[model samples]
Target: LHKEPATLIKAIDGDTVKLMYKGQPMTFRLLLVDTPEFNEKYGPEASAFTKKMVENAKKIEVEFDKGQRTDKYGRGLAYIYADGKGVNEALVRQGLAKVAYVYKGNNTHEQLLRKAEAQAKKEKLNIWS
Candidate 1:
């Protein structure tokens, strides 16, 4: 559970964000979730939701899983926390994202994310609708 404070530079989309980490500009791909692309349905709303959370957060942090730190695209793989709230789980709870890219030994927040997805699915929210 390596966590580091960060400053939001941009919300690239619902599942991707750029931040000032350790005094360097870095891009991070939120782990345990996948959101619609910019051209896809619900994309704008998902991005807006993420933007609102990160932009308005007084404190932001990125926590790395015990496994890989970066994806093939070189983006940091992390769990984002904004004001002590888990952004990945929040996205799933809102039905804006789905639990995904889960791999063996890296299921740190799988249970929490899956539970959020289940509730969203039961309610037929956004993507679930």
Candidate 2:
């Protein structure tokens, strides 16, 4: 990050974000929530929304339950949280996202995510609608 930690920033179309970790600059890809595919519908909207949220806020809390923080690409996988609410769950609650399990990955949040997914489905949120 070029600025201080108090500043918030969004990601680009390439799905890369700059993070400040332990006084070091790092790039990482968020996990647990997947936006629309580039070749698929709602992709642009989803990306834009993420940009808006990230750009408007700062000092987000990230919880990575998995032992390995980064994937093969060396990008840290994180579950985004803001205002004591999980962003992934928020996305799911709006039906804009789903519970995307990366195989035997960190599934500790599976049950809650699935519940939110089901609730969003029942509520006909966004994509589900």
Candidate 3:
């Protein structure tokens, strides 16, 4: 996300979001992290958390050091950023996601995010019930 986030239509899951720009729907999955599923323990919470922050706005600039492309499901792989802060990392920091590390080469929040995920898992913040 840039200075102002684009209009978010909805949060599809802990790792995916739906946005509207210029009357077009832009689907984005938070890159480098695989969060809890929508039906897994805190899955809905994680998804809700992201939705709370990004549902509906204007002009969000996504940071994809890895570039914009699709994963197996064909969803765009983008690292969401707001004011230089990473939305992906933000969710993990909030104990809402786990670092998926999809692309290790272009990982921007490698150390910081890994550290947080380690803690979240150790503390069992959202999984391993």
lDDT of 2 by residue, 18-118 (tens): 65665666665656666667566666666666666655564666667655668887776766655445656766666767678663366667788789889
In the range 1-129, model 1's lDDT, one tens digit per residue, is 967899999999999999999999999999989999989999999999999999999999999998888888879889999999989999999999999968535679989899999999999999999
Give the distance in Å from residue 27's predicted Cα in candidate 1 to where it truly belongs: 0.4
TM-score of each: 0.96, 0.77, 0.74
> Which pairs, if any, clash in model 2?
none
Q: Residue 104 error for model 3, in Å? A: 7.6
Sort the predicted structures by lDDT, highest score first: 1, 3, 2
Best by TM-score: 1
Q: lDDT for every model?
A: 0.93, 0.62, 0.68
Task: Flag clash pairs in model 1.
Answer: none
List the candidate 1 regions with Cα displacement exceeding 4 Å: none
Candidate 2 lDDT at 78 equals 68
- The positional error of residue 112 in candidate 2, measured at the CA in angstroms, is 0.9
lDDT: worst 10-residue window of model 2: 1-10
